[PDB]
């Protein structure tokens, strides 16, 4: 099968491990440990195709640049998670698009930008204009998801398996 390699990244609590076990387990799951980084492996199918995917879910414990950097070069997507609650988890994912791209050196890199939290919209911090206006600087789609409802959670992952299949 093809196996499809998603990084979750994006700050902390941003919602990177609810994603990944709503899209794993159907589960919300609000007390995973912060701290705690882990893979997981799915058959799915993608348009008709059996593949895998291995998702990464990142946690920010790796501070060594050249193991950080090793990580992403074998990554082949990368979602890349802020929470609209939080306008500094927005400004974070530059940092996180540019170590991509320094280790991808492809701007065209599989990666969409994903607003989580959609359910707390009284509590928005970051407009839906200013994410999209980040995306088409950066080229990249822009979803805002809810690992609480499930809102769009498929589809970022199913989304970015359509931009590896398509590019690699
Ligand atoms: N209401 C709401 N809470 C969320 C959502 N996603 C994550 N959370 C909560 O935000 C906290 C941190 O989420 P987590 O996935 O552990 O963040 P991570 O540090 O990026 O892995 C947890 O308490 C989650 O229950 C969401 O879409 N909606
Ligand atoms: S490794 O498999 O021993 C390992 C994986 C993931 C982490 S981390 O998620 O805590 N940190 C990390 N890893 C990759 C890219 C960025 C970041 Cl922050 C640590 C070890
Ligand atoms: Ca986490
Ligand atoms: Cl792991």
């Not at 990554?75 to 170590?99: H, K, N, P, W, Y």
Request: charge should be negative; aromatic fraction near 10%.
């Amino acid at each position: 099968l093809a196996l499809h390699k998603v990084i979750m990244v994006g700050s902390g609590g941003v919602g990177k491990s609810a994603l990944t076990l709503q899209f794993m387990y159907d589960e919300f799951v609000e007390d995973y440990e912060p701290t705690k980084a882990d893979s997981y492996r799915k058959k799915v199918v993608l348009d008709g195709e059996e593949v895998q995917i291995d998702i990464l879910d990142t946690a920010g414990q790796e501070d060594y640049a050249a193991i950080r950097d090793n990580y992403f070069r074998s990554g082949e997507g990368f979602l890349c998670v802020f929470s609209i609650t939080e306008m500094e988890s927005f400004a974070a994912t530059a940092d996180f698009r540019e170590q991509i791209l320094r280790v991808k050196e492809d701007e065209n890199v599989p990666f969409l930008l994903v607003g989580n939290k959609s359910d707390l919209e009284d509590k928005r911090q970051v407009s839906v204009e200013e994410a999209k206006n980040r995306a088409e600087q950066w080229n990249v789609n822009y979803v805002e998801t809810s690992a609480k409802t499930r809102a769009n959670v498929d589809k970022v992952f199913f989304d970015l398996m359509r931009e590896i299949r398509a590019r690699l």
